[PDB]
Amino acid sequence: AEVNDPRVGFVAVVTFPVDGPATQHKLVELATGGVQEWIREVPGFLSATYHASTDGTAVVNYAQWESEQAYRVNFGADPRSAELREALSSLPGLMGPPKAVFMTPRGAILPS
Amino acid sequence: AEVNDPRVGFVAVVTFPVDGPATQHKLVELATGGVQEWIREVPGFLSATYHASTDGTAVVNYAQWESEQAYRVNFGADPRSAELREALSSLPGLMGPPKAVFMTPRGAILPS
Ligand SMILES: O=C(O)Cc1ccc2c(c1O)C(=O)c1c(O)cccc1C2=O
Numbered sequence: 001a002e003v004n005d006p007r008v009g010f011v012a013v014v015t016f017p018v019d020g021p022a023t024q025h026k027l028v029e030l031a032t033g034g035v036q037e038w039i040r041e042v043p044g045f046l047s048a049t050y051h052a053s054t055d056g057t058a059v060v061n062y063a064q065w066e067s068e069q070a071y072r073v074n075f076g077a078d079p080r081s082a083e084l085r086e087a088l089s090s091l092p093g094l095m096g097p098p099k100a101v102f103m104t105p106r107g108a109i110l111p112s
Numbered sequence: 113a114e115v116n117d118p119r120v121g122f123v124a125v126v127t128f129p130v131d132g133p134a135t136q137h138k139l140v141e142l143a144t145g146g147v148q149e150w151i152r153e154v155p156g157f158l159s160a161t162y163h164a165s166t167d168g169t170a171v172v173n174y175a176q177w178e179s180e181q182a183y184r185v186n187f188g189a190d191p192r193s194a195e196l197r198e199a200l201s202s203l204p205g206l207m208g209p210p211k212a213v214f215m216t217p218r219g220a221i222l223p224s
Contacts, residue, residue, distance in 0.1 A: 002114055003161045003174065011163055013125065013172065015213075024218075032219035040224045047222050049115040051123055051215035054180075060125065060215055062115065062174055068166070101127075103163035103172055106136075107144035110159050111152050 001046045001064050004108035008046055010065040014100040016088070021056040023093025028052065028059060030091060031084070038080055044070020057095075068102070113158045113176055116220035120158060121179040125172060126212045128200070133168040135205030140164065140171060147199045150192055156182020180214075 001008055018024050028050045039045055046064035053060065065071045075081050089097065113120055130136050140162045151157055158176035165172060177183040187193050201209070 003159050003176070011174075013174070028219045032221060036221065039221055045223055047115050047220060049220040050218050052218045053213060053215045055214075058213070058215075059218075060213065062123075062125070064115065101170070101172065102166045103170075104166060106140040106162055106164050106171075108159060108161045109144060109148055109151060111157060 004105070004110065005046075005064075007066055008064045008105055009067045010071060011103050011105060012061070012063045012065070012071060012100050013103065014061040014063065014098050016059040016061075016098045017095035018057060018059055019093045019095055021052070023091065024052040024056060024059050026093065027088065027091055031059075031061070031088060036084060038078075039075070042070070042078070043074050045075065115176075116217070116222060117158075119178055120176045120217050122177040122183050123215050123217060124175045124177070124183070124212055125215070126175065126210050128171040128173075128210045129207045130169065130171060131205045131207055133164065135203065136164040136168060136171050139200065139203055139206065142200065142203060143171075143173070148196055151187070151196075154182075154186040154190075156186050 016027055018027060031050060044066035046066060048061050048063040051060045128139060130139060143162050156178035158178060160173055160175045163172045
């Protein structure tokens with residue numbers, strides 16, 4: 001969604017510490033893989049954008065949800081998200097467990 | 113811009129450590145209060161979205177830029193960026209210097 005689209009009521013920013021650029025590509029390819037297309041149909045899901053830190057040490061997902069309830073239950077209570085969490089945690093090259101920060105969009109500076 | 117727009121070539125995620133929600137509010141109000149009106153017109157600037165972390169301890173800015181070069185030339189090398197940083201670091205309740213992470217968008221999942 002646009003960054004200031006009013007449907008975004010909740011955001012998660014999830015950082016995955018990795019050992020280098022190869023694992024950054026391998027981690028992204030696993031989270032955007034084709035078998036994860038069920039996420040697209042989760043109610044309240046707006047987007048998940050994976051990035052590779054320029055220094056090669058991390059993968060960061062900026063994810064847009066309609067609400068904290070959509071993330072925690074619609075997504076979080078589905079068995080598939082536990083499945084996905086395990087697979088991401090077992091990938092070789094990870095340096096530690098992912099760390100998420102939860103937040104609410106409060107203001108945006110945009111070009112006219 | 114849409115989070116997956118191909119024009120987004122460079123992203124900075126900037127975290128400001130604060131002492132609680134009242135300061136989170138004031139820092140977002142400062143950031144969108146007119147101090148960075150000038151940024152809107154800068155070539156390559158796509159957006160800056162300020163969020164309040166739900167735990168009350170930080171304000172995070174997810175900024176989209178057309179490329180790393182436009183960011184360095186049009187924001188980093190412009191002395192008004194130091195002006196901006198002086199303004200945001202002047203607020204009472206700001207507990208440390210901002211931390212930034214530079215990255216490039218690599219994959220995204222959008223609804224369907
Ligand atoms: O829970 C953690 O602590 C780590 C963690 C691992 C994988 C995922 C998440 C996550 O948070 C997400 O948030 C997440 C999201 O918001 C939107 C889409 C996908 C994921 C996702 O695949």
